Write an enzyme that holds these catalytic residues in place. Structure first.
Site, PDB file in Angstrom:
ATOM      1  N   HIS A  18      20.924  41.351  83.393  1.00 31.31           N
ATOM      2  CA  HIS A  18      21.490  42.590  83.901  1.00 31.31           C
ATOM      3  C   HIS A  18      20.448  43.609  84.384  1.00 31.31           C
ATOM      4  O   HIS A  18      20.743  44.390  85.263  1.00 31.31           O
ATOM      5  CB  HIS A  18      22.452  43.228  82.899  1.00 31.31           C
ATOM      6  CG  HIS A  18      23.691  42.419  82.749  1.00 31.31           C
ATOM      7  ND1 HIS A  18      24.680  42.401  83.716  1.00 31.31           N
ATOM      8  CD2 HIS A  18      24.059  41.530  81.798  1.00 31.31           C
ATOM      9  CE1 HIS A  18      25.629  41.566  83.341  1.00 31.31           C
ATOM     10  NE2 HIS A  18      25.267  41.003  82.190  1.00 31.31           N
ATOM     11  N   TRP A  88      27.508  48.156  80.042  1.00 31.82           N
ATOM     12  CA  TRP A  88      27.706  46.756  80.256  1.00 31.82           C
ATOM     13  C   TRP A  88      28.143  46.018  79.002  1.00 31.82           C
ATOM     14  O   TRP A  88      28.968  45.085  79.071  1.00 31.82           O
ATOM     15  CB  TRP A  88      26.478  46.095  80.899  1.00 31.82           C
ATOM     16  CG  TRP A  88      26.781  45.755  82.324  1.00 31.82           C
ATOM     17  CD1 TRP A  88      26.482  46.501  83.434  1.00 31.82           C
ATOM     18  CD2 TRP A  88      27.497  44.607  82.793  1.00 31.82           C
ATOM     19  NE1 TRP A  88      26.940  45.861  84.556  1.00 31.82           N
ATOM     20  CE2 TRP A  88      27.580  44.707  84.203  1.00 31.82           C
ATOM     21  CE3 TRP A  88      28.089  43.490  82.161  1.00 31.82           C
ATOM     22  CZ2 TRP A  88      28.205  43.750  84.981  1.00 31.82           C
ATOM     23  CZ3 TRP A  88      28.669  42.528  82.930  1.00 31.82           C
ATOM     24  CH2 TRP A  88      28.730  42.645  84.336  1.00 31.82           C
ATOM     25  N   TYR A 134      28.809  35.126 102.167  1.00 36.09           N
ATOM     26  CA  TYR A 134      28.966  36.261 101.242  1.00 36.09           C
ATOM     27  C   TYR A 134      27.652  36.627 100.541  1.00 36.09           C
ATOM     28  O   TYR A 134      27.194  37.789 100.565  1.00 36.09           O
ATOM     29  CB  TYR A 134      30.045  35.980 100.215  1.00 36.09           C
ATOM     30  CG  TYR A 134      30.009  36.997  99.115  1.00 36.09           C
ATOM     31  CD1 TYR A 134      30.397  38.305  99.358  1.00 36.09           C
ATOM     32  CD2 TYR A 134      29.522  36.685  97.861  1.00 36.09           C
ATOM     33  CE1 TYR A 134      30.297  39.297  98.417  1.00 36.09           C
ATOM     34  CE2 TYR A 134      29.398  37.718  96.879  1.00 36.09           C
ATOM     35  CZ  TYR A 134      29.771  38.987  97.178  1.00 36.09           C
ATOM     36  OH  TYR A 134      29.722  39.962  96.252  1.00 36.09           O
ATOM     37  N   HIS A 171      31.650  32.761  85.909  1.00 32.91           N
ATOM     38  CA  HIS A 171      31.204  34.137  85.826  1.00 32.91           C
ATOM     39  C   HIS A 171      31.397  34.771  84.439  1.00 32.91           C
ATOM     40  O   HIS A 171      30.566  35.549  83.991  1.00 32.91           O
ATOM     41  CB  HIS A 171      31.992  34.908  86.849  1.00 32.91           C
ATOM     42  CG  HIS A 171      31.358  34.911  88.166  1.00 32.91           C
ATOM     43  ND1 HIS A 171      32.027  35.301  89.300  1.00 32.91           N
ATOM     44  CD2 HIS A 171      30.091  34.616  88.544  1.00 32.91           C
ATOM     45  CE1 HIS A 171      31.199  35.223  90.330  1.00 32.91           C
ATOM     46  NE2 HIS A 171      30.022  34.824  89.900  1.00 32.91           N
ATOM     47  N   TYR A 186      23.364  30.952  90.096  1.00 32.20           N
ATOM     48  CA  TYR A 186      22.875  31.563  91.354  1.00 32.20           C
ATOM     49  C   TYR A 186      21.533  30.975  91.708  1.00 32.20           C
ATOM     50  O   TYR A 186      20.740  31.571  92.414  1.00 32.20           O
ATOM     51  CB  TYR A 186      22.773  33.114  91.223  1.00 32.20           C
ATOM     52  CG  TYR A 186      24.104  33.825  91.215  1.00 32.20           C
ATOM     53  CD1 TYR A 186      24.895  33.890  90.055  1.00 32.20           C
ATOM     54  CD2 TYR A 186      24.578  34.428  92.360  1.00 32.20           C
ATOM     55  CE1 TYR A 186      26.130  34.534  90.076  1.00 32.20           C
ATOM     56  CE2 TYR A 186      25.832  35.096  92.370  1.00 32.20           C
ATOM     57  CZ  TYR A 186      26.577  35.117  91.237  1.00 32.20           C
ATOM     58  OH  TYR A 186      27.783  35.742  91.244  1.00 32.20           O
TER      59      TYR A 186
END
Length: 191
Positions: A18, A88, A134, A171, A186
């Site tokens: 993060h 978060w 995207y 996810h 990713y």
């Protein structure tokens, strides 16, 4: 719920994942980011790069708003790293509670909004070229190799498309839990 998913908020790799996204979203290195900037970026991508209709763009904006809003970000407020990571933890906790109760998560809501735009056929699944379009517009992935790794990590259907059900599960694991099954989702772009 098909999985038993739990948080791992003290794992330095969770925090680091993060922090990577924080630094990537803080494009000018101000040390803080606002909800205004996040929804600007989101709508810029879908409207100006991906062809979204007005109704599709608004649905997407609402979902992005509520996602970052769940992590505590607000219009007219600058969020620094300490507040961001605190928020978060709350977001992930709330999402995993909804998941465990078979209630729609904010990541699912966003995925369904984004896939309506990205999938040429509006059937809830995307091709590799659509995933490349995207992610490279957003900048979250820069290289084709890394986009390709996503299709390796996920379970792909027989037509070679990544469906929203599968991407939501991946996810949940990647952003909220440190599920080791989702590493390299990713590729090398996000640790």
């Amino acid at each position: 719920a098909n999985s038993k998913l739990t948080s791992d908020f003290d794992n330095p790799r969770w925090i680091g994942r993060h922090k990577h996204m924080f630094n990537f979203l803080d494009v000018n290195h101000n040390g803080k980011i606002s909800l205004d900037e996040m929804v600007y970026k989101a709508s810029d991508i879908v409207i100006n790069n991906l062809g979204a209709t007005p109704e599709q763009a608004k649905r997407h904006k609402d979902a992005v708003e509520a996602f970052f809003g769940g992590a505590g970000m607000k219009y007219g407020v600058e969020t620094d790293w300490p507040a961001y990571i605190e928020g978060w933890k709350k977001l992930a906790t709330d999402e995993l509670e909804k998941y465990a109760k078979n209630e729609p998560t904010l990541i699912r809501i966003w995925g369904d909004a984004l896939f309506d735009i990205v999938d040429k056929d509006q059937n809830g699944a995307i091709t590799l070229d659509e995933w490349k379009a995207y992610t490279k517009a957003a900048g979250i992935i820069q290289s084709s190799e890394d986009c390709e790794e996503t299709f390796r990590v996920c379970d792909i259907d027989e037509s070679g498309q990544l469906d929203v059900d599968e991407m939501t599960r991946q996810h949940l694991g990647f952003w909220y839990t440190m599920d080791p099954a989702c590493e390299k989702l990713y590729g090398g772009a996000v640790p």
